[PDB]
Design an enzyme around this catalytic site. Structure first.
Site, PDB file in Angstrom:
ATOM      1  N   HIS A   1      -4.230   7.079  -3.171  1.00  0.00           N
ATOM      2  CA  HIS A   1      -5.096   5.910  -2.824  1.00  0.00           C
ATOM      3  C   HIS A   1      -6.583   6.258  -2.855  1.00  0.00           C
ATOM      4  O   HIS A   1      -7.272   6.027  -1.901  1.00  0.00           O
ATOM      5  CB  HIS A   1      -4.664   5.292  -1.509  1.00  0.00           C
TER       6      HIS A   1
ATOM      7  N   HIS B   1      -7.373   5.257  -8.580  1.00  0.00           N
ATOM      8  CA  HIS B   1      -6.469   4.110  -8.300  1.00  0.00           C
ATOM      9  C   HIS B   1      -7.254   2.788  -8.299  1.00  0.00           C
ATOM     10  O   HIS B   1      -6.844   1.821  -8.997  1.00  0.00           O
ATOM     11  CB  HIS B   1      -5.692   4.366  -7.016  1.00  0.00           C
TER      12      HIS B   1
ATOM     13  N   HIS C   1      -9.873  -2.889  -3.150  1.00  0.00           N
ATOM     14  CA  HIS C   1      -8.657  -3.322  -2.405  1.00  0.00           C
ATOM     15  C   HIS C   1      -8.079  -2.192  -1.545  1.00  0.00           C
ATOM     16  O   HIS C   1      -7.281  -2.498  -0.667  1.00  0.00           O
ATOM     17  CB  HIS C   1      -7.612  -3.915  -3.334  1.00  0.00           C
ATOM     18  N   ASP C   2      -8.446  -0.930  -1.762  1.00  0.00           N
ATOM     19  CA  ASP C   2      -7.929   0.192  -0.908  1.00  0.00           C
ATOM     20  C   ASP C   2      -9.113   0.972  -0.302  1.00  0.00           C
ATOM     21  O   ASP C   2      -8.953   2.151   0.087  1.00  0.00           O
ATOM     22  CB  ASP C   2      -7.008   1.101  -1.729  1.00  0.00           C
TER      23      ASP C   2
ATOM     24  N   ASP D   1      -1.604  -3.630  -8.639  1.00  0.00           N
ATOM     25  CA  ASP D   1      -1.481  -2.508  -7.685  1.00  0.00           C
ATOM     26  C   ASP D   1      -0.349  -1.574  -8.097  1.00  0.00           C
ATOM     27  O   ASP D   1      -0.474  -0.373  -7.809  1.00  0.00           O
ATOM     28  CB  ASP D   1      -1.286  -3.087  -6.310  1.00  0.00           C
TER      29      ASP D   1
ATOM     30  N   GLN E   1      13.349   5.927  -7.390  1.00  0.00           N
ATOM     31  CA  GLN E   1      12.561   5.190  -8.408  1.00  0.00           C
ATOM     32  C   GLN E   1      13.413   4.036  -8.927  1.00  0.00           C
ATOM     33  O   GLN E   1      12.878   2.867  -8.954  1.00  0.00           O
ATOM     34  CB  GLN E   1      12.020   6.126  -9.507  1.00  0.00           C
TER      35      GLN E   1
HETATM   36  C1  LIG Z   1       4.380   1.583  -3.455  1.00  0.00           C
HETATM   37  C2  LIG Z   1       4.815   2.291  -4.760  1.00  0.00           C
HETATM   38  C3  LIG Z   1       4.181   2.107  -5.908  1.00  0.00           C
HETATM   39  N1  LIG Z   1       4.523   2.655  -7.094  1.00  0.00           N
HETATM   40  C4  LIG Z   1       5.564   3.506  -7.151  1.00  0.00           C
HETATM   41  C5  LIG Z   1       5.911   4.241  -8.422  1.00  0.00           C
HETATM   42  N2  LIG Z   1       6.292   3.775  -5.998  1.00  0.00           N
HETATM   43  N3  LIG Z   1       7.388   4.615  -5.801  1.00  0.00           N
HETATM   44  C6  LIG Z   1       7.625   4.418  -4.533  1.00  0.00           C
HETATM   45  C7  LIG Z   1       8.645   5.108  -3.742  1.00  0.00           C
HETATM   46  C8  LIG Z   1      10.035   4.532  -4.240  1.00  0.00           C
HETATM   47  C9  LIG Z   1      11.089   5.134  -3.382  1.00  0.00           C
HETATM   48  N4  LIG Z   1      11.415   6.404  -3.404  1.00  0.00           N
HETATM   49  C10 LIG Z   1      12.328   6.537  -2.440  1.00  0.00           C
HETATM   50  N5  LIG Z   1      12.951   7.751  -2.190  1.00  0.00           N
HETATM   51  C11 LIG Z   1      12.667   8.972  -2.816  1.00  0.00           C
HETATM   52  C12 LIG Z   1      13.862   9.912  -2.402  1.00  0.00           C
HETATM   53  C13 LIG Z   1      14.491   9.284  -1.208  1.00  0.00           C
HETATM   54  C14 LIG Z   1      14.022   7.868  -1.245  1.00  0.00           C
HETATM   55  O1  LIG Z   1      14.403   6.892  -0.616  1.00  0.00           O
HETATM   56  C15 LIG Z   1      12.608   5.388  -1.786  1.00  0.00           C
HETATM   57  N6  LIG Z   1      11.809   4.453  -2.405  1.00  0.00           N
HETATM   58  C16 LIG Z   1      11.764   3.024  -2.110  1.00  0.00           C
HETATM   59  N7  LIG Z   1       6.802   3.527  -3.921  1.00  0.00           N
HETATM   60  C17 LIG Z   1       5.939   3.140  -4.815  1.00  0.00           C
HETATM   61 MG   LIG Z   2      -3.311  -0.756  -0.349  1.00  0.00          MG
HETATM   62 ZN   LIG Z   3      -3.671  -0.063  -4.119  1.00  0.00          ZN
END
Ligand SMILES: Cc1cnc(C)n2nc(CCc3nc(N4CCCC4=O)cn3C)nc12
Ligand SMILES: [Mg+2]
Ligand SMILES: [Zn+2]
Length: 312
Positions: free
Chosen positions: A67, A71, A105-106, A216, A268
């Protein structure tokens, strides 16, 4: 007068949704001015005031893994690509407001979620009980607009100025991913039952909110090597928050537990299926020329699938 011009490769590829702004920090301000000049006009802002605004915004981004100022500028470029592919859909004030909103925005992000601030009992969690960091980012935006020589909107009327700051406030609050799910469902229902109406202010608000989410999340719309390396920055933050959760004696969610490094590929998948694909699908229905974003997202989902199958 004084155009900004970019080298040939950047001049061509900046127009594409998948553009990566590159590792040269000192070119990012110039890249932003170039995007404002083409998407808004060379007349939208006084160059000196805009340059001074950009540099104070940069100064108020922190040296955190994801962030950060790169970004901010990346999210502005995705908005630029959306605005350029939808010439006639947006008002003059929206063109002005939305690139600023994206850059701001951040602002002053510390690398921690709203949830960590509430559990830590950060003062910001008492000042702003929901969308904590997003209300902080809008507050930081107003602060900087009010510094001497930084009022880039100085030639708008009181009511236009009020409208632009209200576009920026909503666009920024909309980047709270907790608010995205319900906004996308409302837009989905509206699109399908045919009630979606772009002259309805509260409808435009929702559509701009979804654009804000799309911009975003735009790391999932890049070339696979960009997507994969950005993910490492995203997790570097999450896992540091995980550590800070363990210091408060709280088990972090799996997303923030570095102990589950190995499950990242499956994390992912869930995130593309639950968050990203639905986001670009609904955006493409409302704004058909944003399809390249959906197509790139689907490409990257299939790369994470290849990683799970051990083919990469
Ligand atoms: C806000 C944002 C934006 N852009 C991207 C590419 N990402 N990737 C994410 C995390 C996804 C995610 N990874 C996990 N994991 C990892 C291992 C255990 C587990 O649960 C759960 N989740 C939901 N968040 C974002
Ligand atoms: Mg934000
Ligand atoms: Zn952002």
């Amino acid at each position: 007068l004084m155009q900004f011009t970019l080298p040939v490769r950047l001049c061509k590829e900046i127009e594409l949704f998948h553009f990566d702004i590159g590792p040269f920090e000192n070119m990012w301000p110039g890249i932003f001015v170039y995007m404002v000049h083409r998407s808004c006009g060379t007349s939208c802002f006084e160059l000196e005031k805009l340059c001074r605004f950009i540099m104070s915004v940069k100064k108020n981004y922190r040296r955190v893994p994801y962030h950060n100022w790169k970004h901010a500028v990346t999210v502005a470029h995705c908005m630029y690509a959306i605005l350029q592919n939808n010439h006639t859909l947006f008002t003059d004030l929206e063109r002005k407001g939305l690139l600023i909103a994206c850059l701001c925005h951040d602002l002053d992000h510390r690398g921690f979620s709203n949830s960590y601030l509430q559990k830590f009992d950060h003062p910001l969690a008492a000042l702003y009980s929901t969308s904590t960091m997003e209300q902080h980012h809008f507050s930081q935006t107003v602060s900087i607009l009010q510094l001497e020589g930084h009022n880039i909107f100085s030639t708008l009327s009181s009511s236009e100025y009020e409208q632009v700051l209200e576009i920026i406030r909503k666009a920024i609050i909309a980047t709270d991913l907790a608010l995205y799910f319900g906004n996308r469902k409302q837009l989905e229902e509206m699109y399908q039952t045919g009630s979606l109406n772009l002259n309805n202010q509260s409808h435009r608000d929702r559509v701009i909110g979804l654009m804000m989410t799309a911009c975003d999340l735009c790391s999932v719309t890049k070339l696979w090597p960009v997507t994969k390396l950005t993910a490492n920055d995203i997790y570097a933050e999450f896992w540091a928050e995980g550590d800070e959760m363990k210091k408060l004696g709280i088990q972090p969610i799996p997303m923030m537990d570095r102990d589950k490094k190995d499950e990242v590929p499956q994390g992912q998948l869930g995130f593309y299926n639950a968050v990203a694909i639905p986001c670009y699908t609904t955006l493409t229905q409302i704004l058909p020329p944003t399809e390249p974003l959906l197509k790139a997202c689907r490409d990257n989902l299939s790369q994470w699938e290849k990683v799970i199958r051990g083919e990469e």
